[PDB]
């Protein structure tokens, strides 16, 4: 039941949310990053200075080698390993066990994070971006095929809210929608294509002010929803215009562009934080109806990430828009794979001050925005 999935995620600010899983027989307990921005179930399977535990295939009576390697380079870093299958469960998830593909990472560069407390990665996106190719069934595909779990999951990412990185908590509800996790209406935007969880943004506003761009710029070359990115990441042209508008709303009080550049923290002390001077930001996502859209509106509390010190959690992108955790933390997000759509609703874990609230509001009519 869904009650038992509530609060089944943890993590440290900036270091991703993870869910406890078990792999093999007897069950090996690993914390696994919940990542909607990739499609491989891949787990540390050998000693690494940042890992205090890892998947030992040889200790699993139910392991099966696929005798096939996989190498996954990416911008920041890389990982490589050896493919197999084994029984997998999520203790605080559905009460089922599945035989899933598992990439046992044997080597890796700048992949694991010091102190993050996860040992692996649960790629929840689609086969199309799976490595080494699209024939390696992703975990969720296996789960749905092998069980009667409905082809849907939802993420309520809560952040930290009020020496060591703040802890975050959240819930990953698999196989349904938990009504206690949100208030108000759920609004849906179509998954444009089943690879990433790709969506379309049709408009963005900073404190009500339209950035007035060709909406193609918002989705250049794609816009995705990615729990495995911390930041709201924007294409260059949009980032610049965004930060411009933001710098203006908060003109009273100045910061070094080290801050705006997302590598330099700024601090007030104990509750002096002037949330009020930072503007809300609305992303309008395409509706299920051609000419409709709806907006999700996010507060400075979500895009200033605590490190009272914060880092600016909007950053520039050369690979399109990424609606990462700081955007998702306002909301209850439904990855309705079965109806090919992503719904958004105001989250029960509401990090709002007494003047503003994150919001999901629609419809808005917009009378072509994709790559
Ligand atoms: C953007 N992204 C990645 O770089 C990553 C990926 C997956 C396969 S290769 C790259 C990845 C790998 C390792 C760590 C993290 C990460 C770090 C901090 C916070 N949250 C996630 C993300 N998953 C996504 N979506």
Curated annotation (Swiss-Prot):
Residues 1-371 are extracellular. N-Glycosylated. Addition of a bisecting N-acetylglucosamine by MGAT3 blocks lysosomal targeting, further degradation and is required for maintaining stability under stress conditions. The modification N6-acetyllysine is found at residues 68, 212, 216, 222, 236-237, 244. The active site is at residues 35, 226. Glycans are attached at residues 95, 114, 291. It is found in: Cell membrane; Golgi apparatus, trans-Golgi network; Endoplasmic reticulum; Endosome. GO terms for molecular function: amyloid-beta binding; aspartic-type endopeptidase activity; beta-aspartyl-peptidase activity; endopeptidase activity; enzyme binding; peptidase activity; protein serine/threonine kinase binding. It is a single-pass type I membrane protein. It is an enzyme of class 3 (hydrolase). Disulfide bonds join 158-349, 215-369, 267-309. Monomer. Interacts with RTN1; RTN2; RTN3 and RTN4; the interaction leads to inhibition of amyloid precursor protein processing. Interacts with SNX6. Interacts with PCSK9. Interacts with NAT8 and NAT8B. Interacts with BIN1. Interacts (via extracellular domain) with ADAM10 (via extracellular domain). Interacts with SORL1; this interaction may affect binding with APP and hence reduce APP cleavage. Interacts with NRDC AND NRG1. This is Beta-secretase 1. It comes from Homo sapiens. The gene is BACE1.
């Amino acid at each position: 039941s869904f009650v038992e999935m509530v609060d089944n995620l943890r993590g440290k600010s900036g270091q991703g949310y993870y869910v406890e899983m078990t792999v093999g027989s007897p069950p090996q307990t690993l914390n696994i990053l919940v990542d909607t921005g990739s499609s491989n179930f891949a787990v540390g399977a050998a000693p690494h200075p940042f890992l205090h535990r890892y998947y030992q295939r040889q200790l699993s009576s139910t392991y099966r080698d696929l005798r096939k390697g996989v190498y996954v380079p990416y911008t920041q870093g890389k990982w490589e390993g050896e493919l197999g299958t084994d029984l997998v469960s999520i203790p605080h998830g559905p009460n089922v066990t599945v035989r899933a593909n598992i990439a046992a990472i044997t080597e890796s560069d700048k992949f694991f994070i010091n102190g993050s407390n996860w040992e692996g990665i649960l790629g929840l996106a689609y086969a199309e971006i799976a490595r080494p190719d699209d024939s390696l069934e992703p975990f969720f595909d296996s789960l749905v095929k092998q069980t009667h779990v409905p082809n849907l999951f939802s993420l309520q990412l809560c952040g930290a809210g009020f020496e060591v990185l703040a802890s975050v908590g959240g819930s990953m509800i698999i196989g349904g929608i938990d009504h206690s996790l949100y208030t108000g209406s759920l609004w849906y935007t179509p998954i444009r294509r089943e690879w990433y969880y790709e969506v379309i943004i049709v408009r963005v506003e900073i404190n009500g002010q339209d950035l007035k761009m060709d909406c193609k710029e918002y989705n250049y070359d794609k816009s995705i929803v990615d729990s495995g990115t911390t930041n709201l990441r924007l294409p260059k042209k949009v980032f610049e215009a965004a930060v411009k508008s933001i710098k203006a709303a908060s003109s009273t009080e100045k910061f070094p562009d080290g801050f705006w550049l997302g590598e330099q923290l700024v601090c007030w002390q104990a509750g002096t934080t002037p949330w009020n001077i930072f503007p809300v930001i609305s992303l309008y996502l395409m509706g299920e109806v051609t000419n409709q859209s709806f907006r999700i509106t996010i507060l400075p509390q979500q895009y200033l990430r605590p490190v009272d010190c914060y880092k600016f959690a909007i950053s520039q992108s050369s690979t399109g828009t990424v609606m990462g955790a700081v955007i998702m933390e306002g909301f209850y997000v439904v990855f309705d794979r079965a109806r090919k759509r992503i719904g958004f609703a105001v989250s029960a874990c509401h990090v709002h001050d007494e003047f503003r609230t994150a919001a999901v509001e629609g419809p808005f009519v917009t009378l072509d925005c994709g790559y």
